[PDB]
Amino acid sequence: SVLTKAIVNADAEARYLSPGELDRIKSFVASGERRLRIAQTLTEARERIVKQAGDQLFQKRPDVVSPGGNAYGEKMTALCLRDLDYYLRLVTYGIVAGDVTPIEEIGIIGVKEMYNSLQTPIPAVAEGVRAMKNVATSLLSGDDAAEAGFYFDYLVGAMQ
């Protein structure tokens, strides 16, 4: 969260929170109520976002859902969609937190290693997240979408 990040920087410096740091905290608390609504919207639309994004991903990457591909088969396709759902849940957590840290601990550290063992292609996963972003953006209002976009972009950046 924003607050955790600020505290951590202060502790490293071994100082009380700077005025500038305090100001950022103030801004965050004001923003929070708006943020809560954005998160709520995505949660309600979660099921459809995942479904639509999946379809887009499969169109973008025929290979993944092909006999060679990892996603191929009902069991595997479900798992791929479950993964997309996981990332969406993480994004909602991020929006309320105001920072990527919650997202980062659960999803972005060791992600490469996990997927490499699974043999899932990392770029395809990124495409799925991009797809989810587009669906989510449409449901969100423009300003809301921009906020959500940042978190979505981070995920895409983290895993590529």
Partner 1 sequence: MQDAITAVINNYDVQGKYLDGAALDKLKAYFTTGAVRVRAAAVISSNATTIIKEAAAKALIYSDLTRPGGNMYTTRRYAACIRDMDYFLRYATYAMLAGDPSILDERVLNGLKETYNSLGVPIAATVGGIQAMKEVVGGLVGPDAAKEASIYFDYLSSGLS
Ligand X SMILES: *[C@H](C)[C@H]1/C(=C/c2[nH]c(/C=C3N=C(/C=C4\NC(=O)C(CC)=C4C)C(C)=C\3CCC(=O)O)c(CCC(=O)O)c2C)NC(=O)[C@@H]1C
Q: C-alpha 143: how far from its chain's center?
A: 18
First to last CA, the chain: 24
Take residue 55 and report the two structure tokens written for it.
């379809």
Site for a second copy in 72-111 (CB under 8 A): 72-77, 81
Site string for a second copy, 24-43 (x = CB under 8 A): --------------------
Q: Tell whether residue 157 is a contact of a second copy (CB under 8 A).
A: no
Confirm or deny that 70 is annotated as ligand binding: yes
Q: Concatenated DSSP letters for 75-97?
A: HHHHHHHHHHHHHHHHHHHHHHH
Q: Token match 């909602």: residue?
A: 92
Q: Which does 22 bind (CB under 5 to 8 A by kind): ligand X, partner 1, a second copy, none?
A: partner 1
* Assigned token pair, 44: 């309600």
**By the criterion CB under 8 A, which residues form the site for a second copy?**
44, 47-48, 51-52, 54-56, 58-69, 72-77, 81, 116, 119, 121-123, 134, 137-139, 141-142, 145
